[PDB]
Amino acid sequence: SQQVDKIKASYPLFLDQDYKDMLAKKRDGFEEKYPQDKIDEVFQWTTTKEYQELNFQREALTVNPAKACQPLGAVLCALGFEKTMPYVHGSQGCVAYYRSYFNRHFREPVSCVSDSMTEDAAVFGGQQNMKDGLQNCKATYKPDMIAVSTTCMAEVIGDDLNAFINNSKKEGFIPDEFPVPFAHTPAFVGSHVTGWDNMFEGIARYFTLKSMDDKVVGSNKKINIVPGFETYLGNFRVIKRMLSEMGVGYSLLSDPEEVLDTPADGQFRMYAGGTTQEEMKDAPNALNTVLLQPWHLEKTKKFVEGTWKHEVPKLNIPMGLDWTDEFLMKVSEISGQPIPASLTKERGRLVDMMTDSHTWLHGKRFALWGDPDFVMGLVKFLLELGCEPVHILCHNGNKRWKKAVDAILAASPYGKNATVYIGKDLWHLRSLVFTDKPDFMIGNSYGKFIQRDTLHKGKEFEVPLIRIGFPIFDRHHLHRSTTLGYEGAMQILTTLVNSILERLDEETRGMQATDYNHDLVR
Amino acid sequence: SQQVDKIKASYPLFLDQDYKDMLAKKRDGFEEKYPQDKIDEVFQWTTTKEYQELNFQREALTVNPAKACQPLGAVLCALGFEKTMPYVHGSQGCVAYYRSYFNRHFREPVSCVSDSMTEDAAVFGGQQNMKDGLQNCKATYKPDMIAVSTTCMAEVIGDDLNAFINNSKKEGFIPDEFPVPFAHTPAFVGSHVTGWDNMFEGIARYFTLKSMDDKVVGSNKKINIVPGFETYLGNFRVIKRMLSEMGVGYSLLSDPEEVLDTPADGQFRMYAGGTTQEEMKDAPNALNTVLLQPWHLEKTKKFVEGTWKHEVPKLNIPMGLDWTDEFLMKVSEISGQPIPASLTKERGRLVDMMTDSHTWLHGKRFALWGDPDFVMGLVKFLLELGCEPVHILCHNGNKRWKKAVDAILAASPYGKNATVYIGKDLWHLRSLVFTDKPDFMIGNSYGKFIQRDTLHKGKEFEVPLIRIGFPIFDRHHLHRSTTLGYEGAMQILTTLVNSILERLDEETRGMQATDYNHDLVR
Amino acid sequence: SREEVESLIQEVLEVYPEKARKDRNKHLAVNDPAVTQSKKCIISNKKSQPGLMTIRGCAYAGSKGVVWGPIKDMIHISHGPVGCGQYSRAGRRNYYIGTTGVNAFVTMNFTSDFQEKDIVFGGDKKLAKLIDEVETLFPLNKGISVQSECPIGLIGDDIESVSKVKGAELSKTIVPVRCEGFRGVSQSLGHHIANDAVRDWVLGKRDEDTTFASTPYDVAIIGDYNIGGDAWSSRILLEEMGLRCVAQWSGDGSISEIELTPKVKLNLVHCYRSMNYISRHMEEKYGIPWMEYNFFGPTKTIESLRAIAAKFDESIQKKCEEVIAKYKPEWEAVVAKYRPRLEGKRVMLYIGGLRPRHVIGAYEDLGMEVVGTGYEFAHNDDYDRTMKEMGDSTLLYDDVTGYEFEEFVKRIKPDLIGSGIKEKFIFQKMGIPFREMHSWDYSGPYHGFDGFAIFARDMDMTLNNPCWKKLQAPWE
Amino acid sequence: MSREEVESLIQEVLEVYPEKARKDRNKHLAVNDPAVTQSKKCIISNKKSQPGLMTIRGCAYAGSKGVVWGPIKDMIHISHGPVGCGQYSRAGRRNYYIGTTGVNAFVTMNFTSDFQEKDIVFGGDKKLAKLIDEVETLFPLNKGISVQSECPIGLIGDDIESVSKVKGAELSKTIVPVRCEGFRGVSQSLGHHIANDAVRDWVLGKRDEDTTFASTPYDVAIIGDYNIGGDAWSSRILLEEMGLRCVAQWSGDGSISEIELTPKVKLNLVHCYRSMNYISRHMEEKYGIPWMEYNFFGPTKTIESLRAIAAKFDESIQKKCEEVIAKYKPEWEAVVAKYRPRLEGKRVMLYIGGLRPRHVIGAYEDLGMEVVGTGYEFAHNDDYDRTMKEMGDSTLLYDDVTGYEFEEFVKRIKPDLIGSGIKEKFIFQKMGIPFREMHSWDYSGPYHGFDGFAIFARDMDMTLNNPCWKKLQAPWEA
Ligand code: ICS
Ligand code: CLF
Ligand code: CLF
Ligand SMILES: [Fe+3]
Ligand SMILES: [Fe+3]
């Protein structure tokens, strides 16, 4: 039933008595459901240390992964180039998913094509798909460049991307000079960040490998910036803003901020902004190259040092106070530009915010996850704030990374109760927040299901989620946020302390019970 | 008791059983408390339509006002000028309260002085306080200017500010060239915004009234901007950024953003930034003067039009989409600068955000309060988002203002169920939120006590607070936010839609009860 | 129209190369009432042209994301690399009642997370170990399905042998599903693969059992995936009409419900495309008749309630009219409020395999006109059903390309578009109100009388929203 | 560090003042000398603030409404006058209470007559009388009303005493007039006194002829604890564990009835001498009730106070006293073992109101810290007499310190920690000196008793050893 002037959506419509009795009869009648006390009993079991030990013995089963496959990263990297169409050689369903995944996080159009490889091509190869694919995409969506990656069926089959593209051009399907960089992106190797690295290195060597003879390091007086897999628009924006404030010349290599934030002004813009082919051709002439997320840009690093002869600085992701300081000082030394008053003051305003909020941040225990560079940057900043990063989980992390984070933890008293986990998923993390309860989770939207699980045990056990990372599907426009630099540290500090104070307000809202501590001033 | 490794603060320490039994014993023995059943009955009575009718019959009693007294705004206005010390002629308790009130909102030092008038100064005037006060202040805190307001005791006894200041100069307590603008700021007239208007007009007269002979309208090719009572740092900044993007020469009169955001770098800076005496002196040579908050700048307007001979344009506060459009189009006409591509895109990005989020905002019902200009801007923007501003309260609003807001409501389908209240306090508003329950409140920290009252009636009756306005004491660093322009509309939009979605997640977190609607994607 | 539409079709196709142009021409048609065989005017269920940005998914989406995933008390393994199960975790709102992680598992992502070692040596030993770990950690699961991702078939794995072996060892239902994404040309074959897996590994295991107490009014909702609650808003009506809905395939469905279906008297098929296969099997093996029905809007819902009631006796037919009389004032108030605000506005649709024709009636019940529609993966029998619901001279498009859709919208200029997430933000930027017709834009349900209220509210809130007035800056 | 150095710091700082202010402030700055025991030979206090020097002081309204009357939870307190005073003081002070706000308790609400110019020209007595009726209609469960006068009331000639007596008789309710106008006195201090006398004159004697209260040998009253963050509850719990019965708490979480029962107790336990010594002296002469001062800051002082209070009773209480001491002994020793190593040797400078500048010294010393400077906003000479006993030799004393002096003293002394108020906090944080609000406890607490020492120690450690303080200088500014 419905009241016309107060329409009910699924919630709370299905809480009306007649829907409840219907659902009760369906379950009792035909579902053959386990008794409720057996459900409550098994649930309690899943919150115990005993279950956790079984949970961490898993070898073959993954549950609720905190990572994606390589081609997702090759797509995002390609989208950062001017009028470039990402092209995933292989089966089409992959691309449907890649677009939907990014659609829901950015709430923007996301352009990507497949050559719709089929079980037939599994026998004689996808060569014909590439030839018709490239010619169709070029003529239909008129990109200036087509950046090719692969789905996992193409990798298994063994399609030689380089030869298929050369032949496409040889047989006339696309012009010889039309740029078609490529990268093999096997889903069964690494994760989505590896796909980013592979694509970018592929694009870099396409525009440079055979033209090194005329290159001179430093001749264009710029600094190459490689952002990596990055899904906050404000992180592309803050970097470019800080370098302009310093008078530093720079080339941001892979810049998707324009295309992922076009205005709604009556027309659709498939392409916007992005790194130019000519910035890439001229990149070897830079003073040097800075990798903003070095722990998933290893292949890129070998190419820029091996071919471009740049001496890539050892720098952590510019997150938090110290690592932003180090970033700006290394940029200053390379460029010969001093750090301007406007960044010195912004730095002090961050510190002022730190001193202002430290009493509510001190000792706060956190579980967190994400990609390796983002995770270690968050760990560093938490330690700078006096917080304790109790559970640190990076599904696509490795041993060398874990040793670096462990050393960061050991250099501070706020890391003494922290443990770093690699290769574990969000079902592992669920056990950790039950057996060693933190105060909050810092993670992506998949964390909302762990919060729900914790609340079900009891309100005293609930671990609220703070959404920082990727993907964020259940809040609007957080992709506009910033997490790098002083600006990003300011935003994270604000989100953290206010998440603490909002939760305190909830627990002290009880009239005559707990509202003695419901202070107006905090 | 305490366990040394998990120290409990007041919450939840006093929930321990020994404190609980102790408090129960205190109540039963010596408090002579009304029985709980009687307390419940009265509470439920305070939520009814009949209590509301008695509540709105009030004539003499005010409960939980939503405004402050004039000198508060005069102090804020004065802080906006270079190396200026605000100075309140009267009794010292006022200054301790003004500084503290701003201290807790901005989390920054707030410099202000009194001349400590006592019982003896009430019988013979505070002339001697003024003479020594001015000399003591100048010699001790070395300001380039002292802006003088009054407390209510100084107003009642009739201290002639102009004469006392002239006599301080003639008797040599401060140099005759030392700038000492003044304004009478009776607490029993208007509110804190009236004190801003009075102070600014006072400062404007001091630097321009006797020197109009050489001034030619439009000769410095700038536009003057008067911000009014403004407690968001982002609002000063966004106004200055947009005029800089437009290439429009301008002069912001009263600009406190620097002194209200100094860095923590090892030294305390009593003064910073602010508009210069040279700028106030040259302001008549501007093309025109734009009032950002005209509904509390009536006195400034009369002077600007009556003495400077500018024709202040009719512009609403630049909040939301239409009024920011109108602001920029009027600034373009006056300055001859075209609206640049970068502001056109930012506008289109705001409209994009409106289309991405309109589904969750539509029809949402709000109660809101604040100062007149801020409220009507919030009202206008909410109508543009498809929201219904059901309860609109402005304690310090007037009848002509209410007519303007009613005309805005009438011109939209989403104003059909809206009512504008003037002269009513937050105890009036509490009744409205029970009898005609909205979905959310938008207001300052004082609203947290109304949310607590609604929850105590029931979770299904709770009305969450969204913190926008002044003062915000119980969250950290929201004074850094923006509410003006496209940027402020974007921030407001994001806060509103994510407050809606955060509440939905709360109401659908119950496992096997309501989590069928606990969607990953929203 | 007619002439202007065919001229628009030729103009759009002039950008394609020869091969694609000649193929895409066969997938675009103008509806003509003196031509009722869709075969004589449009081709469908063909391979997608490479590199034209099709909207289609794959057979894994058709089987795991559509048919199997919603079954709530089973654990479904995304067998292969990590991507497939992550991108489709919780993306489809097939609602259900349960305790997630304990006895229900719909929004969780189980996967074997293939590494390169599994590509070289094979994943069958990994699968066997994975099943044991599932059993130890999720004891209350009632059966496992193994949803094959692209690599499984290509490397020669034998997931059927693992299923038979482990199923016998543990005495558990383990369903191998060969829905590798390279099979077929779209999600559609995944439906078929999925229907056959149900038939071969689940549906025949209570042929032996009679312990179920049957009634002459037992039915099954075949092909309702309870998007936003759509199936619950339909079940309620069928049970008010006096019927007993024994199972819901697969929206909020349990495996035991599925196993009970061969005992019903009538299979009520909502989604013909995804489930006609198993409906046809159940008629052959068990004698159960099946009928298509439509619960989008009051007109179609009333017609369907009466058509279903006519398959039973006078008592059901009487309760049918009782339900129609009960809800009459409710949807009439909805029309009385929202039709005036929507009448005369034109709509263009593009969706999957049923809704492009099924929701037309609901739009018409609000005075709206569907000037164009199309499917991602429909067959010709779908289009036969579509030619009857669409007006004369309307535009039809099969497996539409992003370019085609954009160009048609620019010339036709509809007041509203209803499509998917990959299309929503394109047309919002062009200034055209958009409503997702897959996920219901996180609203719904839209089925039944209670769903029509939300549908009408939703179309009105979007079409007439104040944001559409302000896309152009007053200075341009 | 040395006496000769601090004396030269004092005079060098005063070189900036005009001559008049110079001579006055020199009398409010002193350095402690263990040979001089009477403040009336070393420092003067409770004098008018000099104009224009940015004093930290409040007014008499703050001292009466803000600190004394406002915490009384089941009365309604009217900020009588223009809108300002009540709004700036709404919920600024954390005098915690149990109650149902808006129904039977009203502490964090702001009731006011919101004077307009009509009320200035015609007077507010007719307005006040109407307001009392409206309060009675909308807040029926209030157990009395106070009328806290703001600056204009006394200046325009209103007679709130008349309104109080008339309306109180008509409605049979306790209506208390308080002439605490902000221009009276020199600080909050006279607001304490005005408020104490208003309690005496209008509340305290209401049950002088009542004999229905059941007395015990162990009845006491906590006089001058305003339950900042629960401070009074974590003190009450100890007193009643020792076997006593706290009949009343003035005024933190206090009810009017508790106030009216206080003349029945056996002993008045005065925590804040400054604010409540007046009513304590009155109750000794009128009712014969003795009063003693005590200190519940830190384990050393709390143990000392417990034994002193127990010695006023019989052997059974003294036995339970040593039971409490032994019960909490392992808990506060754990706090020291963990936090003293982290704070010992650090130097503290204080500036607060009228009690804590001396009262919290023993707690800091219990954590090995050294209070090198302290001062009061509005203390009297008997407070400074008590301070010379608690303060070390050669430490700096400052009465009604100016913002300029406090900053200059900090620059020279360079203390590791500053404990003061909200108007000082953000000044010194920017200077890089850790700061802890010693009024509001920085929204932490309680700090009284043994449970409070655990929080206190935790709070000093988190702020003094916080990582933020080593980041103030940018690496490229060195
Ligand atoms: S199953 Fe099919 S594409 Fe019939 S694969 Fe698809 S939940 Fe669509 S038009 Mo998404 S044949 Fe269902 C469908 Fe229709 S996922 Fe849903 S909306 S009625
Ligand atoms: S068509 Fe369909 S979705 Fe595509 S893979 Fe194939 S089954 Fe799956 Fe999964 S893992 Fe990633 S996304 Fe592909 S590349 Fe290998
Ligand atoms: S010293 Fe003390 S606080 Fe000052 S007024 Fe006087 S009682 Fe009050 Fe209130 S309203 Fe505003 S702040 Fe003053 S100017 Fe009149
Ligand atoms: Fe968008
Ligand atoms: Fe600050």
Side-chain angles (χ1 to χ4, degrees), chain B residues 366 440-444 451 464-468 495-496 499-500:
Chain B
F366 294 85
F440 293 89
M441 288 180 284
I442 300 168
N444 62 27
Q451 169 170 12
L465 176 65
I466 303 177
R467 286 162 177 74
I468 304 181
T495 295
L496 292 180
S499 293
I500 289 158

Side-chain angles (χ1 to χ4, degrees), chain A residues 352-353 355-356, chain B residues 106-109 262 477 479, chain D residues 426 429-430:
Chain A
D352 179 86
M353 289 171 62
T355 73
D356 277 356
Chain B
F106 291 116
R107 312 191 176 266
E108 295 278 288
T262 59
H477 305 301
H479 71 275
Chain D
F426 306 110
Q429 281 192 347
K430 280 169 193 305

Side-chain angles (χ1 to χ4, degrees), chain A residues 106-109 260-262 477 479-480, chain B residues 349 352-353 355-356, chain C residues 425 428-429:
Chain A
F106 295 109
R107 304 182 185 270
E108 289 286 288
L260 292 174
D261 193 22
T262 55
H477 308 304
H479 69 277
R480 312 187 69 81
Chain B
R349 284 164 169 177
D352 182 88
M353 290 174 57
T355 60
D356 298 335
Chain C
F425 309 106
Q428 276 183 344
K429 293 176 182 304

Side-chain angles (χ1 to χ4, degrees), chain C residues 61-62 65-67 92 187-188 191 223-227 230 270-275 296 351-356 375-377 437-440 447:
Chain C
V66 171
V67 172
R92 209 238 204 160
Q187 298 98 297
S188 185
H191 299 161
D224 198 336
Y225 305 87
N226 208 32
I227 308 304
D230 281 350
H270 212 231
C271 179
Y272 171 82
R273 176 71 277 131
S274 59
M275 290 263 188
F296 279 110
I351 326 166
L354 172 84
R355 299 177 175 184
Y375 302 83
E376 291 184 25
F377 45 79
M437 296 310 283
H438 297 260
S439 69
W440 301 149
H447 292 189

Side-chain angles (χ1 to χ4, degrees), chain D residues 2 67 124 139 147 167 181 202 206 241 275 324 359 469 474:
Chain D
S2 72
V67 338
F139 307 92
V147 189
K167 302 298 296 178
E181 290 94 331
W202 300 90
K206 199 209 283 182
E241 275 175 299
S275 68
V324 169
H359 232 46
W469 303 114

Side-chain angles (χ1 to χ4, degrees), chain A residues 2-5 7-49 51-66:
Chain A
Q2 296 271 34
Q3 326 282 285
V4 63
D5 290 317
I7 312 261
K8 274 126 104 170
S10 59
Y11 176 79
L13 172 70
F14 296 132
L15 303 182
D16 284 337
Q17 191 54 59
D18 62 337
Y19 280 111
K20 286 184 161 302
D21 301 348
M22 180 195 77
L23 287 169
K25 281 194 180 307
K26 173 182 189 299
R27 164 246 285 146
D28 293 337
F30 325 90
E31 285 180 6
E32 307 201 336
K33 183 155 119 179
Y34 280 95
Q36 185 59 37
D37 281 325
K38 190 68 203 307
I39 300 169
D40 293 328
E41 172 192 307
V42 171
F43 171 79
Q44 169 59 35
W45 177 61
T46 64
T47 75
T48 67
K49 171 69 176 192
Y51 185 91
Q52 181 170 291
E53 304 189 51
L54 277 166
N55 192 358
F56 275 73
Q57 290 174 251
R58 293 184 263 138
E59 301 173 9
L61 175 72
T62 298
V63 179
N64 293 338

Side-chain angles (χ1 to χ4, degrees), chain A residues 398-402 404-415 417-447:
Chain A
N398 63 35
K399 192 213 167 200
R400 191 189 196 254
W401 176 83
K402 163 167 158 79
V405 179
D406 274 318
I408 291 160
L409 293 164
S412 165
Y414 301 91
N417 300 306
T419 302
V420 174
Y421 305 89
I422 59 184
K424 310 297 182 298
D425 54 49
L426 297 178
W427 194 253
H428 289 125
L429 195 149
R430 172 183 180 286
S431 284
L432 290 177
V433 307
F434 274 132
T435 62
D436 192 2
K437 180 193 173 300
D439 297 317
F440 295 85
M441 289 175 291
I442 304 174
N444 64 25
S445 287
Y446 298 123

